[PDB]
Every structure is written in C-alpha cells, then in structure tokens.
Design a protein around this ligand. Structure first.
Ligand SMILES: OC[C@H]1O[C@H](O[C@H]2[C@H](O)[C@@H](O)[C@H](O)O[C@@H]2CO)[C@H](O)[C@@H](O)[C@@H]1O
Ligand SMILES: OC[C@H]1O[C@H](O[C@H]2[C@H](O)[C@@H](O)[C@H](O)O[C@@H]2CO)[C@H](O)[C@@H](O)[C@@H]1O
Ligand SMILES: OC[C@H]1O[C@H](O[C@H]2[C@H](O)[C@@H](O)[C@H](O)O[C@@H]2CO)[C@H](O)[C@@H](O)[C@@H]1O
Ligand SMILES: OC[C@H]1O[C@H](O[C@H]2[C@H](O)[C@@H](O)[C@H](O)O[C@@H]2CO)[C@H](O)[C@@H](O)[C@@H]1O
Ligand SMILES: OC[C@H]1O[C@H](O[C@H]2[C@H](O)[C@@H](O)[C@H](O)O[C@@H]2CO)[C@H](O)[C@@H](O)[C@@H]1O
Ligand SMILES: OC[C@H]1O[C@H](O[C@H]2[C@H](O)[C@@H](O)[C@H](O)O[C@@H]2CO)[C@H](O)[C@@H](O)[C@@H]1O
Ligand SMILES: OC[C@H]1O[C@H](O[C@H]2[C@H](O)[C@@H](O)[C@H](O)O[C@@H]2CO)[C@H](O)[C@@H](O)[C@@H]1O
Ligand SMILES: [Mg+2]
Ligand SMILES: [Mg+2]
Length: 589
C-alpha cells in the first residue's frame, strides 16, 4: 500500500514531455517574487501554481541549456541532470529514454553474492572516465569480484575530487563523461554479469555549487549539522523528496543495482517515518531487486531491522585487523587491542562495540547495540577502502604501513575473502598496488586555500597531519600520485598477490562449505597468536588458520577444541605442508 511520492508529471527540474512537445520546467521556491526560466539565452516567466511551485512548458528538447532566474538572479537548477560547464553553469535537458540498453534480462544481485570492488573513476584509469573504466571490466570479471562500488558521481566543483563535495546530486560529474557514458559503463557491467553500486551522500552538500537555499532556505535547518555542512531538514518533505527522487533516478534511469549511503548517523530525522525507512520504501517501489547499504559507525541493527536497509559497512573488523598488524593507537585505533583473540571476538560478534564504553580520549561514551539480529551478509567487511587509506596523512595502503609484511597482507586477504560476511576490496588492493590513495580536491579561491587546514583539524588526532610531508590536497601531483599503475600488476610480488586474490575469489565462488552465509555455522578462536575460523555445514568443514606471530607455527601443534581437518585447500604462500610462517594463513578441509 505504499505509494511513491514521485510522479513524472510533477517532477522538479527539466523533464522531456511526451509526443515531442518539448520540456516541462518545474521548481519550488519559498522566497522568490519573480520566477523565470532562461533557456538557450531567452527568459520566460514561469506560472505560479501555489505552494511555491512554478512551472512552464516549452518546445525545447534534450540538449537545451537552462537555468532559473530568481528575483533577477541567474541560478543553477539543483535538480539538473547534467552540468556540462560545472556547478555554477547552465544545466542540460536530459532524456533518459533514448539510450539503448542491452540489460533487459539482468535481475540484479543479492547481498550474500556480493564481493565489492571500490572504484574511484578519476584515478582508476589514466583517462579517469567511465569509458576507460568500462574497458577494465573484463579484468574485474576474471579477477572474481561481483559488484563494483563506485565512489560518488554527483557534480562537485573543480576538476578532480573524491566525490564527497557533491552539490548537484542528480548531475553526473562532467569530467568523468556524459550521462550516456555512465549508462554505457553500467550496461557493459551488466553484460558481464557484474552488479554496480553507487555511493551517495545524503547527509550534507558540498561547499561550492549548492544553490538550494536560493530557492528555499527551509531545505536546511540550523537544528543540527555534520562535520561537512549544514543540516538537511528531513522534516521538510521537499528535502526528503530531493534525496528519494535522487535514489530513484540512479536506480531506474542509470540502472544501478544498489546505493551505499554515506555517513548515515548524520542523516538526522525525528519524523514518525525516518528518512532511511522512506528511502527503502521509495526504492522498493520500483519493483526490482535494488539494495541499500549504510555507512554507519553506531553499530545499530535497526538500520536493517527497522529501516529495512540491506546491510551496513562496519569498521570494527577493519580496525581490529589493522591494529593487529601495526600496533598503531592514534585516533580511533585506540579503541582496539588487536591480536588473534581480539579478532576472534570481533568476528564472533560481527562488530565489537555492542554497548560497552568507547574509551577514546575526547569521545568517551557507551557505543553500540547487540548484534544478534544481524546475519553474516548484513555486515560489510574490508581491510581497505577510500577512507582507511585516504584519511591517513600520506594515504598509504596497508602493505605500505610500517611493520606490515606482504605475507601479513596476503594472510589478511585470506581471512576477509573466506568469511561469510560481505567483503569489499579497494581498487588495486588485489595486486598490492604501489600507489597511495591520497585526499585531493580542486576548489577555487579561499575555499581551496582552506582545504589543507580543514583536513588537519578533522584528523588532528593523527599526529602525522602536523608533519611536513602531508601531500597538498589541491596540488595536481596529489591526484596523479593516486592513479593506478596498471603495468605493475604483471610482475613480481604484485603478480604474486594478484594470483592469490584470484585463487581466493575462485574458492569463495566454488567451495561448497564457504557458501555458508549463517553465523550459526561460524565459530572462531585462538591459540596464542594463531587465529582460527571454522565453518561447519551439511557440506563439510573448513578452518582458516592465520599465524599473526613473527615465528613459525605447525598446524598440528595448534590447540583447538575440535579435530583439525587434514586437507590443505589453499596456503597464502603456496606451501605444500601444513606449516605457517610468520603472518601466513591456510585453509583446510
Ligand atoms: O509533487 C509534489 C507532491 O508530491 C507528493 O504527491 C504525490 C502523491 O503522494 C502520489 O500518490 C501521487 O501519485 O503523485 C503525487 C505527485 O504528483 C506529495 O504527497 C505531495 O504532498 C507533494 O505536493
Ligand atoms: O557564480 C556565482 C557564485 O556562486 C557561489 O556561491 C554559492 C555557493 O556555490 C553555494 O554552495 C553557497 O551555499 O551558496 C552560494 C551563493 O548562492 C560562489 O560565490 C562562486 O563560486 C560563484 O562565482
Ligand atoms: O537497475 C537495475 C536493473 O533494474 C531493472 O531490473 C529490475 C526489473 O525491473 C524487475 O522486474 C527485476 O526482475 O528486478 C530487476 C533488477 O532490479 C531493469 O530492467 C534492468 O535493466 C536494470 O539493470
Ligand atoms: O602481536 C604482538 C602482540 O601485540 C599486542 O601487544 C601489544 C599490546 O596490546 C599493547 O597495549 C602494548 O602497548 O604493546 C604490545 C606489543 O608490544 C597483543 O595484545 C599481544 O597479545 C601480541 O602478542
Ligand atoms: O563512537 C565512536 C566514534 O565513532 C565515530 O568515529 C568513527 C569514524 O566516523 C569512522 O570514519 C572511523 O573509521 O571509525 C571511527 C570509530 O568508530 C565518530 O566520528 C567519533 O566521534 C566517535 O567517538
Ligand atoms: O573542503 C571541504 C572539506 O574537505 C575535507 O573533508 C573531506 C574529508 O577529509 C574526507 O575524509 C571526507 O569524507 O570527504 C570530505 C568532504 O570532501 C576536509 O577534511 C574538510 O575540513 C573540508 O570542509
Ligand atoms: O547453492 C548451492 C549451495 O547451497 C547451500 O549453500 C547455502 C548455505 O548453506 C547458506 O548458509 C547460504 O545462505 O545460502 C547458500 C546457498 O546460496 C549448500 O550448503 C552448499 O554446499 C551448496 O554449494
Ligand atoms: Mg566516510
Ligand atoms: Mg598456545
């Protein structure tokens, strides 16, 4: 009985009309006294309908260029579907019905079948475009990942950026390609049987290019704010519909298979029906198999059980793993001991913090909720992602941090990719890429000059930010140094690491016991610095043993509360015998 709040007839922005009649322009403004649309340079007064809604139909088609004129001030359309000259320019009218899709028989992907691969379009290839990314899809299919996780595409200011400064949520960022280039990427992924997910940012707008307040200040509220901008007022239905209409566009019009909702703790809403619940209703109304995930640090099961999201990016696993390997304790890493026993516990519980005191300085509070309701696929785990690389002072990858060996890096991959939780990999992780992933931006004027100090303040708990070698986010070189080097994977230890990732992803796909997706069938423990993870189903038994010590441990001498299986299925260093050098792992069955 849920009825969508969206009807193409009343869609805000510029929408092509049936029968070649042109385009319908609509906006909401609470404050303007004169309202016009300027199309291809010509101004036309719009009709007032009441409730601050204005409309006009004109015989212009796709490709027409426009903005709105509010009390004589030319103002970009917040509902723009494309901004070819950037966030301060004219929008282009887009028709979503002309692209020739070939994915009519694609039926999406289930979360339990997802192995995510996080892509930043600008750095993923030299060209930094959708078209170039599409040419790497056969490589990703063969690698064995099943869903691409694309970092945000909403238009932001400047010529490069991560995406979290997006300001025009409906307009794919022009430097990456035109709307049809994005559609071609998704179509190509679906032809290869790969899902495609999009990172969307519904907790804040970026600091340049957000003109919503020019139309109605009440899109926003001073009731609360995030670390990155003013509060989006989800008590205002037009604000709710801004993001639910956006979600529906990506899924329906661009054929994405799911969305990853950035920083859901800062989507503050005290409405009877929470905006997250309504987002789920609105995307489900499309009548497909589209998924919603939350990036949420609160360890709150209700995101799944009440808001009806499909899963949660949960960092406790990542953090416990990193601290295990480095011993680092700055910032949020002070929340974790690390080690085999600690990792066994965090896996057993899904997340570590279920209501106990988080004792980190300046942050002391009771964190989290019981994880019991959540099943394995509801937890998205990783050992690398954009934040856990890029928010480090020098943007170094896990194998690049002091004290981490490539053997430890390879062992960590085996843990991640054999667990029944839903894994994510960051681009280049699979070949132990040599390049960092640094924070880069390209803002104009004083805003641009402020980025570096904003970073140092936001991450001031990390002493490396007060050093002298922090890469300037605004420098071209910082962007270029984050580009993947595709050549390097063909040789040496990059190739060795890649072979292991291929072998792990094959086993995950093929092994009848690792097909398990039930926490009931998963147990963990430790003996000294050796972690064990056991899966038992009707199909048999598997055990992963990871030696997190700096000595050698024979599997036969690991004390276990069950009889260890005898058959060696995969060793991370390709050894014949059941013995674990420092940092090494083995899967037995
Ligand atoms: O377009 C502004 C209105 O959006 C919603 O109205 C929906 C209605 O919920 C739905 O059943 C019908 O099919 O379409 C209309 C949109 O044309 C909100 O419910 C209204 O309050 C808004 O004004
Ligand atoms: O071209 C006009 C100027 O608009 C900008 O100001 C915007 C800003 O982009 C937006 O995010 C903020 O919240 O609203 C203001 C004013 O509407 C800047 O002044 C310049 O970059 C542009 O030249
Ligand atoms: O956006 C992903 C795909 O959405 C639709 O596919 C839906 C379909 O409409 C529904 O009947 C079905 O079986 O669920 C699928 C998957 O969500 C489009 O038809 C596909 O072309 C899109 O790729
Ligand atoms: O992997 C070696 C040991 O690492 C940790 O020990 C840490 C300890 O947690 C920390 O408070 C202290 O300041 O440093 C030591 C490392 O020197 C694990 O807790 C141990 O169980 C491991 O064996
Ligand atoms: O409640 C504990 C702290 O949670 C958040 O910190 C997160 C951070 O947002 C995330 O990017 C990082 O990977 O993990 C930490 C630890 O969970 C809040 O930002 C902190 O203020 C809280 O104290
Ligand atoms: O200039 C805008 C803000 O840029 C950075 O914020 C980044 C943050 O560092 C990154 O981890 C995040 O998730 O993307 C945001 C938004 O781009 C600075 O750290 C902030 O101080 C600036 O306001
Ligand atoms: O589809 C063949 C596999 O079916 C079962 O695997 C289940 C698994 O037991 C369950 O936890 C998970 O939620 O679903 C998978 C099926 O998708 C058998 O246990 C496997 O041995 C089979 O290979
Ligand atoms: Mg984040
Ligand atoms: Mg012992």
């Amino acid at each position: 009985s849920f009825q969508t709040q969206h009807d193409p007839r009343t869609r805000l922005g510029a929408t092509p009309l049936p029968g070649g009649a042109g385009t319908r322009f609509r906006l909401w403004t609470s404050t303007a006294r004169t309202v016009a649309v300027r199309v291809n340079g010509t101004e036309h007064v719009m009709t007032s309908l009441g409730g601050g809604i204005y409309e006009l139909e004109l015989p212009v088609g796709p490709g027409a260029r426009y903005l709105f004129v509010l009390d004589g001030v030319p103002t970009p359309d917040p509902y723009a579907r494309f901004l070819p000259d950037g966030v301060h320019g004219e929008a282009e009218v887009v028709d979503f019905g002309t692209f020739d899709w070939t994915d009519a028989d694609w039926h999406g992907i289930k979360l339990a079948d997802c192995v995510f691969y996080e892509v930043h379009v600008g750095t993923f290839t030299p060209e930094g475009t959708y078209r170039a990314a599409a040419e790497k899809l056969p490589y990703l299919k063969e690698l064995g990942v099943t869903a691409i996780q694309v970092m945000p595409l909403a238009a932001f200011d400047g010529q490069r950026g991560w995406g979290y400064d997006g300001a025009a949520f409906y307009a794919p960022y022009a430097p990456y390609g035109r709307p049809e280039d994005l559609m071609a990427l998704v179509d190509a992924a679906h032809r290869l049987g790969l899902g495609v997910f999009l990172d969307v940012v519904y907790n804040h707008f970026g600091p340049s290019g957000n003109y919503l307040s020019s139309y109605a200040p009440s899109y926003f509220t001073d009731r609360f704010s995030s670390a990155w901008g003013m509060g989006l007022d989800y008590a205002e239905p037009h604000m709710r519909r801004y993001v639910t209409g956006n979600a529906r566009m990506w899924l329906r019009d661009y054929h994405f298979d799911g969305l990853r909702l950035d920083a859901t703790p800062y989507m503050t809403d005290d409405s009877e029906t929470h905006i997250l619940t309504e987002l789920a209703q609105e995307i489900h109304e499309l009548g497909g198999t589209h998924l919603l995930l939350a990036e949420d640090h609160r360890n709150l099961p209700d995101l799944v059980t009440v808001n009806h999201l499909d899963g949660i990016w949960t960092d406790d696993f990542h953090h416990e793993t990193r601290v295990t390997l480095t011993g680092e304790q700055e910032g949020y890493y002070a929340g974790y001991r690390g080690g085999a026993e600690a990792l066994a516990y965090t896996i057993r519980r899904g997340w570590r913090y279920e209501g106990q005191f988080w004792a980190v300085k300046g942050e002391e509070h009771e964190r989290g909720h019981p994880s019991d309701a959540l099943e394995a696929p509801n937890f998205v785990y990783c050992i690398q992602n954009h934040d856990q690389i890029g928010n480090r002072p020098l943007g170094e990858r896990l194998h690049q941090s002091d004290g981490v060996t490539l053997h430890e890096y390879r062992g960590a991959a085996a843990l991640l990719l054999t667990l029944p939780m839903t894994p994510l990999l960051f681009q280049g992780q699979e070949w132990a890429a040599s390049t960092p992933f640094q924070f880069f931006s390209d803002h104009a004027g004083e805003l641009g000059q402020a980025v570096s100090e904003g970073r140092k303040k936001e991450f001031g708990g990390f002493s490396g930010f007060s050093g002298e070698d922090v890469p300037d986010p605004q420098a071209e070189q910082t962007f270029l140094n984050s580009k993947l080097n595709w050549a390097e994977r063909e040789g040496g230890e990059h190739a060795r690491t890649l072979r292991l990732y291929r072998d792990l992803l094959r086993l995950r796909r093929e092994d009848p016991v690792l097909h398990n997706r039930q926490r009931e069938n998963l147990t963990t423990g430790h003996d000294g610095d050796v972690l064990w993870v056991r899966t038992v189903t009707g199909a048999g038994e598997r055990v992963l043993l990871w030696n997190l010590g700096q000595d050698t441990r024979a599997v036969a001498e690991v004390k276990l509360p069950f009889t260890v299986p005898r058959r060696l299925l995969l060793h991370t260093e390709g050894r014949e015998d059941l013995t674990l050098g420092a940092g090494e792992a083995v899967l037995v069955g």
